[PDB]
Design a protein around this ligand. Structure first.
Ligand SMILES: [Zn+2]
Lengths: 576, 557
């Protein structure tokens, strides 16, 4: 709840102290203004109203000091709101790149996007729209209770002790309201969950001629659930109604107590009237706090999202670095284990890749093939075991050395709004034009530039020319080739309709002059025909390991996979 | 615009009664302040204790009456809403059972969930919480104003001085930032899109780095600087605007306006008491009107969406597997054709293939053959009968289809395979499954064919695709509308799906949505759609000999 203290930067900490002191002063001035209605209204309703001038002067002196203090607190509130907005947004932006890729669940990604986007204008005026009214309304009843001690000790003690009862009633009302809203949402979701299934699977039901029995079943289920839900409705006071009832009861009860003291002769009639007015002033802030229920709930949700983003599991760091020679590193796996959850993706996979020798990772286990590349690249650490690069563990590797160690061709191109040369240059902006041209040639991007009107300067991606899959994959391959990483990782998820993209991948694998070890996750014959060795990953473990010809001669699972893929390449509908 | 009000047409009288009851309840909640004023009136008059006791009894009775009225109104209103929402959900269930299948694909799953589960809850909140709260927020300040004017008009006028100052300051603020108010939603949407892009490009930032982080950071800094420049100069106006409507300011104004009047004898001292009781928090009540009416708009948006979906056009039933597309044309929206006067004759036992570049509308025509949408012009006939005249139960035993994103009904695997014919014996289910190259994996499951499938299951995409192909094989439709994207949707298991499709396509009028040319060369009839219309028709060799549009696609591959 109180996550806000860590959000404000250390620069504004003195301003936070000033804001807190001035908020306390504002509450005290408001309480003195409320309590000053005792002598003021006592004299006003007496036989000499002219005596009310002195207490009116004191009230209007407490006011204008209230205005000065509230102006200062509001100014500090706007200042702190802007500072918190800037600081939290920048800290959240800095945190995310260092977050492990395992944390980026679709729900986690949704919450992060909401935190970055929806929290723009809220935090600007959070402290001025929520914290100041909430603190003032929370401390004013207790401030009036304390200030009433000077008027009279037992009255002040009773007023201060009654604040706990009213806050308990307010908390109970909020609890009941939240429970009722949650139950209403859950019941509605339960009622409609049948229809969501009926709409999701509508093609299957319609094509199978089952739409009418399925609709009848869903309708009967809805009717039964509606009958059961309507039977259980019974008399219940809502939370808000209960709190309003509590406030009215407290007001009338304490007014009746004042009347009882008046008729018994302990208080004068003007004193009783003034006490009733101060009673209304004392019960007013609770209505203000109840009014801030939805805004407070929204701000609590936003702060929870920001805390969840900031509390993401950061990856570790290390001091050691790879050799600057840039030669091909030899990659080793030993007792490596990894799992997305209940299912195991890797179960003690262990292998060693010779330096500069291509390695092909194939098999039905789609997750495991990409997981091996992710572990090599360091995006996801292994649950058990070690990942090595020339006697250097990736977990202990320098983040800069890790960034400069591995180049990746992701399944998606991962482009952005900008020129094609800008997209390709991001792999290594410091490269000279000749190296960029060589990367474009090896990635077969020159053909795309011939196709495109304005050449490499053409705007691609989110604007300009909307490149297809076979073109954006070539752009990504150009990105990977341009970067002079000692290690290249290739993950083929290309649309099967492309023609020159396979040639580009083959050129990147074979025609690259850079002597770098290459690991490729491929499904197509041409890419893995050039691989020096192949790893057959199935059921989260390596089943076969060897050269192409050796595996084919052995006739193991890889031979069957080769036959299946070769047959799949020559597929034609309406023929053997 | 009228759709939202038209959905809530049957609830006009219950909602009016709810508004009246809420007005009465709100006026009852303000009763104890009037009773306290009268208590002061008869205390200063030296009334006997019996009269004060009777007044206290009246106040307690009114408190109890208000509580009981509120509880009864909430119970009755929740009951009425429960009946109406049940009727609405029945109507939605019936509607989704008759909208065209292509309506769902355009919207997607998220839009359907938003329609059925979120908007139907916003409608519940509209009926049972938003309208009564808005009625209370409109009745309370009006009743307070009337009562304070009745008490005294001289002190009631000065209450409008802070209100007039608030309105003047708000008006000055709003005109001074006319363009920025319109720009702010646009900039918020831009920053949301950029945040999504920054989150999506995380692997490139991690491996390559560079401008991928700076592109987001610079624009985030620009957005924050825009907000600061927008709202910083209004600190001077906004602090004063907040101070004006503060309760302490109202109390000071009321007392400085009343004490001179009371001292000079121009007003009875009791007549000031309503202003001290009710008048201080009047400004906060005025500001609460906007939040009260916000709920009505937020609910009316959901009502408008639900009615707009309920007003969607349905499928119209007017009046060996040969399909005759006769001058067929189709437009997604009025005035934007996608298919323009195409003619075809899918003869029996001929695997017709539909090929073209991206965005050529081949998928749209293939979908129209299965009646995912009704053809705007012309007619599609199966076995000489227009598809419009065929009911769904009779059409889909003539024109089966296996398109991308196959869907599994929740239940056992024997149910999913036997969805078209539940009465089929288990031997027939296994024969269909073995024909679809999915018998091995189904036997690999722990429970076998009794394993429960659904939204989430151990089967991958390429395996549930073969389960759906097994379902289509067991249905045994004469005509088939095949999509070739199912072949390479799962590259891991491409061969098995290709074998399943080969066994499915056996003596059936197939309409393949071609994506790879090399899988089409054996087809009986090729159809080249360049842009929403046929250009070349004939066998593969004939099109190669022609050397027209098809030759470029073949050379590209
Ligand atoms: Zn409700």
């Amino acid at each position: 709840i109180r996550t806000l203290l860590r959000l404000v930067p250390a620069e504004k900490r003195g301003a936070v102290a000033g804001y807190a002191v001035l908020t306390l002063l504002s509450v005290l001035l408001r309480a003195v203004g409320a309590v000053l209605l005792i002598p003021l209204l006592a004299a006003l309703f007496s036989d000499t109203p002219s005596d009310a001038w002195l207490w009116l002067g004191w009230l209007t002196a407490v006011t204008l000091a209230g205005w000065v203090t509230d102006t200062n607190t509001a100014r500090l509130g706007f200042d702190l709101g802007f500072a918190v907005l800037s600081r939290t947004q920048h800290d959240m932006a800095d945190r995310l790149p260092n977050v492990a890729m395992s944390w980026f669940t679709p729900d986690n990604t949704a919450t992060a996007r909401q935190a970055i986007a929806a929290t723009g204008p809220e935090l600007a005026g959070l402290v001025v729209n929520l914290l100041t009214p909430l603190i003032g309304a929370a401390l004013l009843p207790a401030a009036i209770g304390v200030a009433l001690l000077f008027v009279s000790v037992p009255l002040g003690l009773a007023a201060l002790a009654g604040v706990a009862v009213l806050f308990g009633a307010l908390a109970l009302s909020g609890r009941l309201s939240r429970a009722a809203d949650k139950v209403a949402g859950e019941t509605n979701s339960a009622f409609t969950e049948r229809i969501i299934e009926f709409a999701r699977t509508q093609q299957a039901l319609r094509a199978a001629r089952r739409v009418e029995p399925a609709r009848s079943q869903v309708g009967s289920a809805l009717a039964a659930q509606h009958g059961a839900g309507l039977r259980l409705l019974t008399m219940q006071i809502p939370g808000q109604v209960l709190f309003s009832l509590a406030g009215q009861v407290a007001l009338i009860g304490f007014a009746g107590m004042a009347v009882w003291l008046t008729v018994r002769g302990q208080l004068g009639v003007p004193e009783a009237i003034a006490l009733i007015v101060v009673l209304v002033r004392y019960l007013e802030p609770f209505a203000a706090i109840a009014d801030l229920a939805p805004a407070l709930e929204t701000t609590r949700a936003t702060l929870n999202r920001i805390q969840a983003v900031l509390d993401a599991p950061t990856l570790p760091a290390g001091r050691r670095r790879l050799d600057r020679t840039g030669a091909a590193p030899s990659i080793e796996f030993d007792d490596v284990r990894f799992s997305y959850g209940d299912e195991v993706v890797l179960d003690g996979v262990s292998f060693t890749l010779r330096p500069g020798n291509t390695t092909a990772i194939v098999g039905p286990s789609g997750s495991g093939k990409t997981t091996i590349l992710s572990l090599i690249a360091g995006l996801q650490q292994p649950a058990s075991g070690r990942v090595l690069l020339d006697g250097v563990d990736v977990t202990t590797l320098d983040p800069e050395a890790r960034r400069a160690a591995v180049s990746v061709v992701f399944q998606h191109p991962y482009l952005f709004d900008g020129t094609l040369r800008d997209n390709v240059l991001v792999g290594d902006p410091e490269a000279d034009p000749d190296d960029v041209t060589a990367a474009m040639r090896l990635a077969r991007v020159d053909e795309l530039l011939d196709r495109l009107p304005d050449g490499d300067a053409t705007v691609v991606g989110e604007g300009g020319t909307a490149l297809s899959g076979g073109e954006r994959q070539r752009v990504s391959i150009a990105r990977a080739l341009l970067k002079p990483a000692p290690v290249l990782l290739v993950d083929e998820a290309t649309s099967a309709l492309d023609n020159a993209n396979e040639a580009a991948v083959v050129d990147a694998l074979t025609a690259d002059p850079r002597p770098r070890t290459r690991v490729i996750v491929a499904h197509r014959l041409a890419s893995i025909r050039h691989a020096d060795r192949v790893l057959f990953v199935e059921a989260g473990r390596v089943v076969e390991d060897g050269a192409i010809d050796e595996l084919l001669a052995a006739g193991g699972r890889f031979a069957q996979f080769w036959a299946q893929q070769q047959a799949a390449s020559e597929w034609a509908i309406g023929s053997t | 615009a009228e759709a939202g009000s038209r959905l809530l047409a049957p609830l006009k009288k219950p909602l009016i009664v709810s508004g009246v009851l809420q007005a009465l309840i709100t006026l009852i909640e303000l009763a104890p302040f009037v009773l306290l004023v009268e208590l002061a009136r008869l205390l200063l008059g030296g009334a006997e204790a019996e009269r004060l006791w009777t007044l206290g009894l009246t106040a307690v009775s009114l408190i109890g009456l208000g509580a009981v009225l509120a509880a009864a109104m909430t119970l009755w209103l929740h009951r009425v809403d429960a009946r109406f929402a049940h009727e609405l959900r029945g109507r939605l269930l019936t509607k989704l059972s008759r909208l065209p299948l292509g309506w769902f694909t355009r919207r997607g799953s998220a839009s359907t969930k938003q329609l059925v589960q979120d908007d139907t809850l916003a409608l519940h909140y509209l009926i049972t919480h938003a309208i009564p709260d808005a009625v209370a927020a409109v009745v309370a300040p009006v009743a307070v104003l009337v009562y304070l004017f009745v008490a005294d008009w001289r002190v009631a006028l000065v209450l409008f001085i802070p209100v007039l100052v608030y309105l003047v300051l708000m008006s000055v603020m709003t005109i001074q930032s006319g363009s920025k108010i319109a720009q702010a939603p646009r900039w918020a949407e831009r920053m949301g899109g950029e945040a999504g892009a920054f989150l999506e490009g995380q692997p490139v930032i991690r491996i390559f780095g560079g401008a991928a982080a700076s592109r987001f950071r610079r624009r985030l800094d620009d957005y924050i600087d825009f907000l600061v420049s927008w709202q910083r100069p209004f600190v001077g106006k906004k602090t004063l605007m907040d101070l004006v409507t503060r309760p302490a300011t109202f109390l000071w104004i009321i007392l400085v306006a009343g004490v001179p009047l009371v001292v000079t004898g121009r007003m009875d001292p009791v007549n000031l008491l309503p202003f001290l009781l009710l008048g201080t928090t009047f400004g906060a009540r005025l500001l609460g009107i906007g939040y009260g009416l916000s709920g009505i708009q937020t609910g009316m948006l959901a009502a408008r969406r639900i009615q707009t979906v309920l007003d969607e056009p349905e499928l119209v039933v007017r009046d060996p597997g040969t399909v005759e597309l006769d001058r067929v044309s189709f437009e997604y929206r009025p005035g934007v054709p996608v298919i323009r006067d195409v003619t075809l004759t899918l003869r029996p036992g001929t695997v017709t293939a539909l090929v073209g570049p991206s965005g050529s509308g081949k998928s749209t025509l293939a979908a129209l053959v299965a009646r995912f949408h009704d053809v705007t012009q012309g007619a599609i006939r199966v076995d000489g009968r227009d598809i419009r005249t065929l009911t769904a139960d009779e059409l889909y035993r003539r024109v089966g289809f296996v398109l991308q994103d196959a869907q599994l009904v929740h239940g056992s695997v024997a149910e999913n395979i036997a969805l078209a014919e539940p009465d089929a014996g288990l031997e027939r289910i296994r024969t269909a499954a073995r024909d679809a190259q999915i018998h091995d994996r189904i036997t690999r499951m722990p429970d076998g064919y009794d394993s429960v499938l659904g939204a989430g299951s151990a089967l991958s995409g390429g395996e549930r695709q073969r389960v759906t192909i097994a379902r289509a094989i067991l249905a045994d439709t004469p005509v088939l509308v095949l999509d070739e994207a199912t072949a390479f949707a799962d590259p891991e298991s491409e061969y098995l799906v290709q074998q399943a499709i080969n066994r499915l396509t056996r003596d059936r009028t197939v309409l393949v949505i071609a994506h790879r040319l090399h899988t089409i060369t054996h087809a009986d009839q090729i159809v080249v759609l360049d842009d929403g219309r046929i250009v070349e028709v004939g066998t593969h060799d004939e099109l190669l000999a022609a050397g027209g549009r098809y030759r470029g696609l073949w050379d590209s591959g």
